[PDB]
Amino acid sequence: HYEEGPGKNIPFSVENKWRLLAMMTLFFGSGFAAPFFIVRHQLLKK
Amino acid sequence: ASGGGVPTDEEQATGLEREVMLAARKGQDPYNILAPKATSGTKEDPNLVPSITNKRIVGCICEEDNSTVIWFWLHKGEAQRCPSCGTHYKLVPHQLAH
Amino acid sequence: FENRVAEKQKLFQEDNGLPVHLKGGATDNILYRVTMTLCLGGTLYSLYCLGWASFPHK
Amino acid sequence: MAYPMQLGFQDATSPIMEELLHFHDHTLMIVFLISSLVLYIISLMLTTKLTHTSTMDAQEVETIWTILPAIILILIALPSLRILYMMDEINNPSLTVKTMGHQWYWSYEYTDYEDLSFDSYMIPTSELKPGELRLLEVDNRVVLPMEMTIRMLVSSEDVLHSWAVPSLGLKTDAIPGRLNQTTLMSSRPGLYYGQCSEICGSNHSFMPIVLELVPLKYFEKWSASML
Amino acid sequence: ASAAKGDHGGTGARTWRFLTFGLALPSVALCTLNSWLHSGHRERPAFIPYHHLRIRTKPFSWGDGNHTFFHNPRVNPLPTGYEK
Amino acid sequence: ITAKPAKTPTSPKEQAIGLSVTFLSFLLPAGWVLYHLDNYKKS
Amino acid sequence: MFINRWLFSTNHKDIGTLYLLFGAWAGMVGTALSLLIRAELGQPGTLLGDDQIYNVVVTAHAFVMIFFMVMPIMIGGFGNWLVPLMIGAPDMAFPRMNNMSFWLLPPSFLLLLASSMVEAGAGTGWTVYPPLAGNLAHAGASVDLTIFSLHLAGVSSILGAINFITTIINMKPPAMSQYQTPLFVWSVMITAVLLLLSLPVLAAGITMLLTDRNLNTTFFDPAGGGDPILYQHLFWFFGHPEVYILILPGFGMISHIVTYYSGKKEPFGYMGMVWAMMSIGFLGFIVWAHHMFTVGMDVDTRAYFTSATMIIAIPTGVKVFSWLATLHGGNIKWSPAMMWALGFIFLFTVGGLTGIVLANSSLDIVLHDTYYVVAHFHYVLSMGAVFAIMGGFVHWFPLFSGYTLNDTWAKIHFAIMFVGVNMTFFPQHFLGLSGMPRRYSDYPDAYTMWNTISSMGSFISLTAVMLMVFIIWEAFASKREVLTVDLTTTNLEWLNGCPPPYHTFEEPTYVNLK
Amino acid sequence: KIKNYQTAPFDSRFPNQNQTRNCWQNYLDFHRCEKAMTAKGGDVSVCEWYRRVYKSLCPISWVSTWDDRRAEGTFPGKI
Amino acid sequence: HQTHAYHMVNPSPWPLTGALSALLMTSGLTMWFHFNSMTLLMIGLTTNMLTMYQWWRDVIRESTFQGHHTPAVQKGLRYGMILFIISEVLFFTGFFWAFYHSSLAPTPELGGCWPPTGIHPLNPLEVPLLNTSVLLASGVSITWAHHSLMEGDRKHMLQALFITITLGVYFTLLQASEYYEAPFTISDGVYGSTFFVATGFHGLHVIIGSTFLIVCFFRQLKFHFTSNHHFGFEAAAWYWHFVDVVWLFLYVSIYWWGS
Ligand SMILES: CCCCCCCCCCCCCCCCCC(=O)OCC(COC(=O)CCCCCCCCCCCCCCCCC)OC(=O)CCCCCCCCCCCCCCCCC
Ligand SMILES: CCCCCCCCCCCCCCCCCC(=O)OCC(COC(=O)CCCCCCCCCCCCCCCCC)OC(=O)CCCCCCCCCCCCCCCCC
Ligand code: HEA
Ligand code: HEA
Ligand SMILES: CCCCC/C=C\C/C=C\C/C=C\C/C=C\CCCC(=O)O[C@H](COC(=O)CCCCCCCCCCCCCCCCC)COP(=O)(O)OCCN
Ligand SMILES: CCCCC/C=C\C/C=C\C/C=C\C/C=C\CCCC(=O)O[C@H](COC(=O)CCCCCCCCCCCCCCCCC)COP(=O)(O)OCCN
Ligand SMILES: CCCCC/C=C/C/C=C\CCCCCCCC(=O)O[C@H](COC(=O)CCCCCCCCCCCCCCC)COP(=O)(O)OCC[N+](C)(C)C
Ligand SMILES: CCCCCC/C=C\CCCCCCCCCC(=O)O[C@H](COC(=O)CCCCCCCCCCCCCCC)COP(=O)(O)OC[C@@H](O)CO
Ligand SMILES: CCCCCC/C=C\CCCCCCCCCC(=O)O[C@H](COC(=O)CCCCCCCCCCCCCCC)COP(=O)(O)OC[C@@H](O)CO
Ligand SMILES: CCCCCC/C=C\CCCCCCCCCC(=O)O[C@H](COC(=O)CCCCCCCCCCCCCCC)COP(=O)(O)OC[C@@H](O)CO
Ligand SMILES: CCCCCCCCCCOC1OC(CO)[C@@H](O[C@H]2OC(CO)[C@@H](O)[C@H](O)[C@@H]2O)[C@@H](O)[C@H]1O
Ligand SMILES: C[C@H](CCC(=O)O)[C@H]1CC[C@H]2[C@@H]3[C@H](O)C[C@@H]4C[C@H](O)CC[C@]4(C)[C@H]3C[C@H](O)[C@]12C
Ligand code: CUA
Ligand SMILES: [Cu+2]
Ligand SMILES: [Mg+2]
Ligand code: NA
Ligand SMILES: [Zn+2]
């Protein structure tokens, strides 16, 4: 069966807080950055 | 105008469907399909709560029509009382599948 | 025709730990792999198309 | 037009717009009262160490907080509907002017007697004359006679647009294939501004409306000269 | 309503088969008779290039982009009129 | 609610690092695009 | 094992978790788009120098916040996690179909991002009105990709609604009547009913737009005898129920939070709360044309929609006053969640009241398509929904994860956000009354002050969002495991521990019929 | 004669905001009258009122498009 | 071990393959409508058929073969199907609204009349009437099929179900012929728009309904259904009645009143 309990019922690991910081940073950061880059994409097409 | 060839539940039901069907025939409710009827809930006449383990969550509707349900774990051992109305409940553990 | 439901019930209730989508046998595995390959490949192809359509061809 | 740091509505240019100002004052009072009362009660419930956590009976206070709101709604609805129907009253205009929305300008047609029509484009910021308003000035204004009931017919020749003049309390969507009617009546002479009020693409922010209200005599000579 | 028949003392398989063969299918047979009688190709009307018809705001994603999906040369004219 | 002490405490120094990294992950990319806006507009 | 668990899930908790993750990510996308909006309006002139891009940004912002952030979080996240637990059910009725409701969202989101990448994007407004959205004014794939994104999100929500309604109706303990289920469960069921009835109408309407754009139909094209106003009717017939769909689960969570932190065993006037939500749901289907007061409607029709719309204030008032009556006499626990709930009550009331101002067609002629409308919905919808989501998130985070947040940091986050949203939106009332149109990339000079302040407030909220991410990180980084939770006798979802095991209620609860 | 027209008066048959039919009706009436008059041998000046009303209400592009269609034989209305 | 009667489903790949096939079909339609290619669409349609096949195959395995459909599970499936049908009714409602909006206030472009100038409607007394008797009749035969199953009569269940399906196929063939014979097209203004899109979606539903009945036919041949447990057949029948009622409204509205 699957692991259960705190830190085990999630699709990401919280074993190391710094690797976690990196993960959360890429996750939330990629979401927040996308519109800026889409605008940039549209400005550079013409 | 008429004939047969269609199986019946008695001949073809299987798995859990068959279990519920055969148990219902003996008047039993191992899969909790029915709402149990309350006893007087006194110390001498507590509500008997079946369980296959040593604790079961009980939900007490203190008075008829109450919209608030009082929930608590009932453990094996001495009868416990509803935190709200004090009616008694006692766990009666194990079995189900022979 | 004859009723072979009981045979199928035995096959699908066999204690082999297989999930229902694979419990029928080797064919289930093939069909699943075909399905998932077409889905994943088609998705990669769609991303490719998006990349292509994202830019002007004047 | 709006001025710097404006809080409320533009001053009323027509009697209907004045009517709306008084109705908004009435409604806003109610909005202030109810929101302040709610804030107050939140603070009242949160500022005492006294408690009562047992079951509380509801079918009594629910009457009050059901009947009161109902009365307040009728107190808002009455003057609201009076104005709605008042706007709708038959008024019989002295003039009919049509306006067609286009992808990025308005055209006007005064075809009661002569076949007068022209385009009205926003004056680019680079071409504004000293003292003129950025994004609001047009090359050709909608000259109209003051103190007269005018029928405005609105439509479009492409996408949706919306013809608006806040000071007069007007906003009528410009829909292709449809001819929407509204009546205009200015109590004073002057210049009255509005802006396209339905997203129509790239230059939705740049196709304003400017009405120039003058005495009938000047309106007639202007029509003549515009043929 | 109640129809004009009767039974109702017990609606079972026999009753529904009776309705299938005694009412339903005979109705289908009659309508099939009436239809495959009133058919016969109607003389197609003169072509008039009305602007509210034969709409083309974007070519169709098939054929030459000017023919509807179930185009029938006999009765469906193109924006320029009937075909050869 | 009651809970037990942190199994892996995050000191003030560690929190300053997490907070800074977090703020930077949002601000840098957006800042970069916005800074180069004129470079995109006409190019 | 990872793929089996996270890609092939049939578990309500794991699926609710995927939804919360998806919604949080979408919230980041939606926030960035909103900052781009406010940056363009931060000072007079043009920033992007491309108004079609600005329009595409406004459009995407709305779709993302509504379809990818709010609905997924409230219904897919909190709904999947809490509904089965609150009724003692082993899972949802259709646990496998439930997984597809989730998996349809990433593709739907990809289609939305694709529409903004190809051609010049769909700069239509989230209402997607033709002819602007037609194949002449918006030629190319963009609008078609937007329509398809909505189709996928629509199927996801319709199947989800069927699942929730069936689960809530069919899977309660034998002895529990519908009048013994918690208010959140009621809020989700009513929301599901609105979704079931309204989304198919939107699907019909956008399918008609799709055929007008690609199959030469003319449902909304006057040249073929069509009517652009028909689309508006079909859209708003779905649109108004949708705004209530966005707030109902919020009302549900607010009822639990307020009851919980008031130290109460139950909300004041339970049946009145049930009645209020049902009435709001019902009335929400007969008021749609208040979004069309300037299209040229008959005066009697306008008088009817003005009246019907106002009536919704009565049932809504019963809820507001009941929340206050729940606080009355309570042993108030000033937790971060309670703060979000109190902020909700006040901010929602403000927005609701400006909605009542707008209900009056006479005034709406002047306020329609101006910033007064934008101010109205950012209070009821933006603050209302976001404050309910934050309150529920901080309140149930320990249940979902098994860890506690730092209460001080969470109170700081609330404070910043409260200042930010009010500085951003309150000035917009002034801009609206004075005539500034919505959907504008620039404005006449007189409007400069309020737009400047509004854009500054938008940065304050950005600071709150970044802090929120850090706070979540800190919780997961410190690992303070939960021990005890108060009031579990009237909050069943907490009774199986934090986090509850994969399979809960394998042995159902025992509830007497008496 | 009997004229002295300023603009099209209120018409109880078209009392609402959508005036499309009012314009259309008066355009049809003018051309139906004009046809009957030029046909049976009479004066088009009796059709004047309709001409004035439709001219006042109808967008130039509509009148123009309808005129073009009557000429082409594609006018969908009955005249 | 569980002591409730509900079904905990094994982790399944179908929800994902189904979602991806949705992406492929929508992407596919876009590629077809704009970048003149049917490659994505073809893959999408294929994975969609494969997903439905395997997903419903498994539901049969879980019920007929494993016995997971206890009365509580079957009760939920009943609610699920009723709710599904309700959402379909609302979908069609949008098309009827579109039809009535256009026909009740014909615009000047149509000649200010309905049907529009230049449109020559089909005679509702000809094939449209035949189609009506065909669906009404299949409603009678499927009811006979249902009673035969409940009464344990295999042969007559199969006979009645076969007749129902043949009638559904007859309707489809007749409709296809009507489509080809119609002098008006989908591009003929709002008349052709409302006609083809509404009857077109209905036709799709008739095909889906026929397919569902065919699935039941084969499951019956294989003895899956018992005289008392046969939800798949019941769902097929409810769906079939829905399709029948939608036709009656289309016939009355579009074909008869709209002519
Ligand atoms: C897009 C994803 C970014 C990629 C970054 C990941 C890098 C992996 C390297 C890889 C390095 C391997 C490390 C192994 C283990 C840990 C990392 C993990 O396994 O990797 C992946 C895991 C974990 O996710 C993470 O990685 C970190 C996330 C941390 C989240 C903290 C959330 C706190 C809030 C609380 C939420 C509720 C839970 C609380 C309660 C607790 C639960 C009960 O995700 C998932 O498998 C499921 C998530 C699915 C969907 C979410 C949003 C997607 C939107 C897509 C639409 C796109 C449209 C086109 C858009 C195209 C873009 C232009
Ligand atoms: C940041 C914005 C700065 C604005 C400064 C104004 C400049 C004054 C020049 C000083 C110049 C004075 C001379 C001007 C007179 C012209 C009168 C008129 O023709 O114009 C009429 C206009 C103008 O409005 C006014 O007649 C002034 C009202 C001002 C209300 C200010 C509330 C401030 C709260 C603090 C921050 C906001 C966020 C709180 C949220 C409040 C909820 C709405 O009316 C409106 O439609 C605006 C508001 C509309 C809708 C909101 C309804 C709910 C209010 C809730 C009250 C909560 C109280 C608790 C107390 C609140 C506790 C939080
Ligand atoms: C959470 C989402 C949500 C909710 C709940 C509401 C609730 C309401 N909305 Fe709002 N609304 C939107 C989201 C929402 N709205 C959106 C997104 C738009 C614009 C969409 C777009 O164009 O893009 C919009 C647009 C909008 C319009 C159109 C404006 C225009 O475009 O010109 C109107 C018209 O009447 C309106 C009215 C109302 C009313 C009367 C309520 C009522 O339900 C509010 C009732 C609540 C209260 C009144 C407060 C609590 C009550 C009391 C304390 C009791 C006492 C009160 C009284 C006696 C008055 N809304
Ligand atoms: C749910 C709906 C929602 C939300 C939250 C928001 C949030 C915001 N919106 Fe809104 N907006 C709309 C819906 C919403 N908006 C709609 C429907 C339109 C109309 C579009 C059109 O005209 O077509 C619009 C239009 C619109 C305009 C008008 C554009 C124009 O007319 O030109 C403006 C202008 O300032 C604006 C600003 C903002 C800002 C600054 C925020 C926010 O930054 C305010 C602060 C809120 C947040 C930062 C959200 C944080 C939430 C999360 C990150 C989730 C966290 C997740 C978990 C805890 C699980 N929005
Ligand atoms: C281009 C068209 C194509 C589309 C066709 C659509 C569906 C049709 C497909 C199959 C239908 C036909 C047969 C079905 C297959 C096997 C049938 C054999 C069973 C049988 O013989 O059934 C008999 C019924 O008669 C029967 O078929 C009788 C069946 C015939 C009924 C219709 C014929 C009409 C004849 C003229 C009468 C019309 C007059 C109208 C009067 C007014 C009505 C109210 C009853 O007998 P039994 O002894 O009680 O039964 C013992 C077990 N079978
Ligand atoms: C035989 C009776 C049964 C009808 C269906 C059978 C075959 C057609 C293929 C798919 C139909 C499925 C749904 C209907 C969608 C559009 C209307 C189709 C109805 C139809 O088939 O109409 C035909 C038009 O074909 C056209 O454009 C068809 C063009 C085909 C492209 C399909 C476009 C796909 C658009 C689908 C959008 C899907 C959105 C669904 C949303 C679901 C909810 C989320 C009519 O032909 P015609 O030549 O104009 O006139 C006849 C003159 N002799
Ligand atoms: C826009 C329009 C809306 C505006 C205003 C509406 C506000 C209403 C204002 C006042 C309401 C008056 C209700 C009167 C109830 C008396 C309170 C009381 O005292 O509460 C109980 C009554 O139960 C009960 O009604 C249950 C407890 C109290 C009942 C009512 C509680 C809620 C009151 C309102 C809460 C604040 C929210 C107001 C919203 C505006 C006490 O019970 P007993 O004395 O039997 O037992 C005590 C034992 N003895 C016998 C030894 C004394
Ligand atoms: C091209 C343009 C847009 C395209 C979008 C297409 C989107 C997805 C396409 C692929 C989906 C097909 C896959 C088959 C889905 C079967 C779902 C099903 O059959 O779900 C069932 C529940 O719904 C029930 O009953 C009753 C409900 C039956 C639901 C059938 C699903 C149809 C999906 C389309 C819905 C359209 C919405 C209609 C409104 C306009 C079974 O529930 P499970 O949890 O599985 O099992 C529970 C176990 O106890 C069973 O033993
Ligand atoms: C049933 C509930 C109780 C009834 C109470 C009343 C509320 C709705 C009534 C439903 C039927 C009303 C039909 C009345 C026809 C009169 C109006 C009419 O004639 O409207 C027409 C369109 O109606 C149309 O499509 C009307 C088409 C539908 C619009 C109403 C929306 C409801 C549809 C969804 C309902 C879901 C229920 C599920 C069904 C099983 C055309 O447009 P007008 O604006 O008229 O243009 C004329 C102008 O030129 C003059 O200025
Ligand atoms: C060229 C043709 C391709 C066209 C695409 C669509 C193709 C086919 C759609 C037809 C759907 C077939 C569904 C077959 C379902 C088989 C599984 C089944 O029927 O499963 C049954 C449960 O019902 C269940 O899940 C009920 C499940 C309900 C599913 C019905 C949903 C219809 C799907 C519509 C999708 C499109 C939406 C419209 C688009 C606008 C199993 O229980 P029982 O029958 O009681 O058996 C148990 C007994 O044996 C015990 O003794
Ligand atoms: C709405 C959300 C946005 C919030 C505002 C963003 C807050 C500030 C972000 C800082 O980010 C940056 O700062 C720069 C300037 O300080 C840049 O450097 C740039 O500028 C330089 C010097 O001025 C150079 O050293 C480099 O080449 C360079 O590209 C730029 O890349 C960027 O990452
Ligand atoms: C009768 C029903 C349920 C009562 C119960 O079974 O417990 C209750 C619940 C909510 C009540 C309604 C709400 O309290 C709101 C209204 C309050 C007014 O005092 C009377 C009518 C009013 C519309 C109420 C009528 C009726 O008493 C309702 C509808
Ligand atoms: Cu024209 Cu906006
Ligand atoms: Cu609304
Ligand atoms: Mg508008
Ligand atoms: Na700007
Ligand atoms: Zn009790």
Short mmCIF file of N, CA and C in Angstrom, two decimals, chain A:
data_model
loop_
_atom_site.label_atom_id
_atom_site.label_comp_id
_atom_site.label_asym_id
_atom_site.label_seq_id
_atom_site.Cartn_x
_atom_site.Cartn_y
_atom_site.Cartn_z
N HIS A 1 0.85 -1.23 0.00
CA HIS A 1 0.00 0.00 0.00
C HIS A 1 0.88 1.27 0.00
N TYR A 2 0.23 2.42 0.02
CA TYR A 2 0.93 3.68 0.01
C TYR A 2 1.37 4.10 1.40
N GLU A 3 2.34 5.00 1.45
CA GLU A 3 2.79 5.51 2.72
C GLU A 3 1.70 6.42 3.26
N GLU A 4 1.63 6.50 4.58
CA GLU A 4 0.64 7.33 5.22
C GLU A 4 1.26 8.19 6.33
N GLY A 5 0.56 9.25 6.70
CA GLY A 5 1.04 10.12 7.76
C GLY A 5 1.60 11.43 7.23
N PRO A 6 1.95 12.35 8.14
CA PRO A 6 2.50 13.65 7.78
C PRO A 6 3.66 13.53 6.79
N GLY A 7 3.61 14.33 5.73
CA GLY A 7 4.66 14.33 4.72
C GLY A 7 4.67 13.16 3.77
N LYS A 8 3.71 12.25 3.91
CA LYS A 8 3.63 11.06 3.05
C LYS A 8 2.40 11.02 2.14
N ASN A 9 1.41 11.86 2.41
CA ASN A 9 0.18 11.90 1.63
C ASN A 9 0.21 13.02 0.59
N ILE A 10 1.39 13.29 0.03
CA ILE A 10 1.58 14.37 -0.95
C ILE A 10 2.46 13.88 -2.10
N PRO A 11 2.29 14.47 -3.31
CA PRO A 11 3.09 14.06 -4.47
C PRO A 11 4.51 14.60 -4.52
N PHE A 12 4.88 15.44 -3.56
CA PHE A 12 6.22 16.00 -3.49
C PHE A 12 6.85 15.62 -2.17
N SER A 13 8.18 15.65 -2.11
CA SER A 13 8.87 15.30 -0.88
C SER A 13 9.18 16.48 0.05
N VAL A 14 9.03 16.26 1.35
CA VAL A 14 9.38 17.30 2.33
C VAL A 14 10.47 16.74 3.26
N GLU A 15 11.24 15.79 2.74
CA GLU A 15 12.30 15.15 3.52
C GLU A 15 13.41 16.14 3.83
N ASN A 16 13.75 16.97 2.84
CA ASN A 16 14.77 18.00 2.97
C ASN A 16 14.12 19.37 2.71
N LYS A 17 14.16 20.27 3.68
CA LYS A 17 13.53 21.58 3.54
C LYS A 17 14.12 22.49 2.46
N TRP A 18 15.38 22.25 2.09
CA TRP A 18 16.03 23.07 1.07
C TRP A 18 15.70 22.55 -0.31
N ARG A 19 15.61 21.24 -0.46
CA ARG A 19 15.23 20.68 -1.75
C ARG A 19 13.75 21.09 -1.93
N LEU A 20 12.99 21.08 -0.83
CA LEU A 20 11.58 21.48 -0.86
C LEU A 20 11.47 22.94 -1.29
N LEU A 21 12.33 23.80 -0.73
CA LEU A 21 12.33 25.22 -1.09
C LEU A 21 12.57 25.37 -2.59
N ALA A 22 13.50 24.59 -3.13
CA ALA A 22 13.78 24.63 -4.54
C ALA A 22 12.55 24.22 -5.35
N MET A 23 11.87 23.15 -4.92
CA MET A 23 10.67 22.65 -5.60
C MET A 23 9.54 23.67 -5.62
N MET A 24 9.23 24.23 -4.45
CA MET A 24 8.17 25.21 -4.31
C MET A 24 8.45 26.49 -5.11
N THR A 25 9.73 26.82 -5.19
CA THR A 25 10.22 27.99 -5.90
C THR A 25 10.02 27.82 -7.41
N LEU A 26 10.33 26.63 -7.94
CA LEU A 26 10.12 26.34 -9.36
C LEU A 26 8.62 26.26 -9.66
N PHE A 27 7.87 25.57 -8.80
CA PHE A 27 6.43 25.40 -8.95
C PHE A 27 5.68 26.74 -9.00
N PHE A 28 5.68 27.47 -7.89
CA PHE A 28 5.00 28.76 -7.83
C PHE A 28 5.65 29.80 -8.72
N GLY A 29 6.97 29.73 -8.85
CA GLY A 29 7.70 30.67 -9.68
C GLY A 29 7.38 30.50 -11.15
N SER A 30 7.27 29.26 -11.63
CA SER A 30 6.93 29.03 -13.03
C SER A 30 5.54 29.58 -13.33
N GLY A 31 4.60 29.39 -12.41
CA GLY A 31 3.25 29.90 -12.61
C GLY A 31 3.20 31.42 -12.70
N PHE A 32 3.86 32.09 -11.76
CA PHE A 32 3.87 33.54 -11.75
C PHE A 32 4.60 34.17 -12.93
N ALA A 33 5.64 33.50 -13.42
CA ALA A 33 6.43 34.01 -14.54
C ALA A 33 5.78 33.86 -15.91
N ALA A 34 5.03 32.78 -16.10
CA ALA A 34 4.40 32.51 -17.39
C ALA A 34 3.73 33.69 -18.11
N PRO A 35 2.83 34.44 -17.44
CA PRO A 35 2.20 35.56 -18.17
C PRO A 35 3.21 36.62 -18.65
N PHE A 36 4.26 36.88 -17.86
CA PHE A 36 5.26 37.85 -18.27
C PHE A 36 5.95 37.40 -19.54
N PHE A 37 6.22 36.10 -19.63
CA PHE A 37 6.87 35.57 -20.81
C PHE A 37 5.95 35.42 -22.00
N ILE A 38 4.65 35.29 -21.74
CA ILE A 38 3.67 35.20 -22.83
C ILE A 38 3.53 36.61 -23.43
N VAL A 39 3.51 37.62 -22.56
CA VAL A 39 3.43 39.00 -23.02
C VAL A 39 4.68 39.29 -23.85
N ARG A 40 5.83 38.85 -23.35
CA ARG A 40 7.08 39.07 -24.06
C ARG A 40 7.02 38.39 -25.42
N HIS A 41 6.48 37.17 -25.45
CA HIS A 41 6.33 36.41 -26.70
C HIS A 41 5.49 37.19 -27.71
N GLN A 42 4.36 37.72 -27.26
CA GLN A 42 3.47 38.48 -28.12
C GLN A 42 4.05 39.80 -28.60
N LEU A 43 4.86 40.46 -27.77
CA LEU A 43 5.51 41.72 -28.15
C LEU A 43 6.60 41.48 -29.20
N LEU A 44 7.27 40.35 -29.10
CA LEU A 44 8.34 40.01 -30.02
C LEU A 44 7.89 39.37 -31.33
N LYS A 45 6.60 39.07 -31.49
CA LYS A 45 6.13 38.47 -32.76
C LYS A 45 5.97 39.59 -33.79
N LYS A 46 5.57 40.76 -33.30
CA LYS A 46 5.37 41.98 -34.08
C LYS A 46 4.63 42.97 -33.19
#
